[PDB]
Amino acid sequence: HPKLVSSTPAEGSEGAAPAKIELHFSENLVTQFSGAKLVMTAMPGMEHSPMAVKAAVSGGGDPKTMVITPASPLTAGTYKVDWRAVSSDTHPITGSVTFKVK
């Protein structure tokens, strides 16, 4: 209803890498305390513990429209987008989306 209404992040997407990660909220939040990052949680060679990966966080022409780009070409493996959105009146929403790549 209010808060996050639509996104195209990569909700359990498998196969080709997700193009970008879009987050859209009914509410005009983002009081200078929102952001998002990407971590890889399976990658070849290692299968070592989940670790921070290279993403760039942007927004559209609205502060309430978050747009996260991967900065490296996402290769075969599994990743987690962690996003954290905050409002003026506090009300943190902190959340995550996992996806896979081949």
Side-chain angles (χ1 to χ4, degrees), residues 21-25 29-30 34-36 57-60 62-68 83-85:
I21 284 133
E22 251 173 13
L23 316 169
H24 306 132
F25 318 72
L29 58 121
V30 187
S34 301
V57 46
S58 305
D62 255 71
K64 68 155 183 162
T65 290
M66 216 70 29
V67 177
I68 290 67
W83 65 251
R84 288 131 173 208

Side-chain angles (χ1 to χ4, degrees), residues 62-83:
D62 255 71
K64 68 155 183 162
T65 290
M66 216 70 29
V67 177
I68 290 67
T69 358
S72 254
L74 302 176
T75 152
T78 308
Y79 306 78
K80 219 161 178 165
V81 189
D82 287 323
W83 65 251

